[PDB]
Amino acid sequence: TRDQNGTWEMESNENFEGYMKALDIDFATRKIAVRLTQTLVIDQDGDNFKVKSTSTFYNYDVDFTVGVEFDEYTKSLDNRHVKALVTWEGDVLVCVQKGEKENRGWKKWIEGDKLYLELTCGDQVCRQVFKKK
Ligand SMILES: *C/C=C(\C)c1ccc(-c2ccc(N(C)C)cc2)s1
């Protein structure tokens, strides 16, 4: 399946530290962030996505259209400008963020009753598994 709608609660988080470090997020933010359960709210209508992740102390909001390039100012994260593009490979959703960092982006897919998120930056791979609320 390609359907990723829902409110998703984090079950496991393998190597989040490794990924955040590759982005140059400040240590103080990293230490707090690795302990926190995330609630991911995905609103997917055709090719239009509105994604909100929230925790006790941090917000992450982004709106995008699949197959349409867009200029991003990553305000709350690392404060950079990137040219972003999101597409499909079989049943895997693939984002490439073109800019300074290499291999920057992510992949999301389903196997059984879980959502896999693979976040990449450089030579690091973070694997997160979520289950539906
Ligand atoms: C496709 C889903 C993506 C890219 C994300 C979901 C949560 C994200 C996130 C949460 C929190 C932080 N910090 C720095 C607290 C960064 C990213 S990205």
Numbering used by the authors: 1 to 133
Manuscript text:
Gratifyingly, the red shifting properties of T51V and T53S to M1 were additive, resulting in 47 and 23 nm, absorption and emission red shifts, respectively (M8). Thus, the M8 template (Q108 K:K40L:T51V:T53S) was retained for further protein engineering. We first focused on the Arg58 position, introducing aromatic residues (M9-M12) to the parent tetramutant M8. However, results were disappointing with most mutations resulting in modest hypsochromic wavelength shifts. Additionally, comparison of the M10 and M11 structures shows that introduction of Trp58 results in an almost 90° rotation of the entire chromophore, altering the position and therefore interactions of the imine at the opposite end.
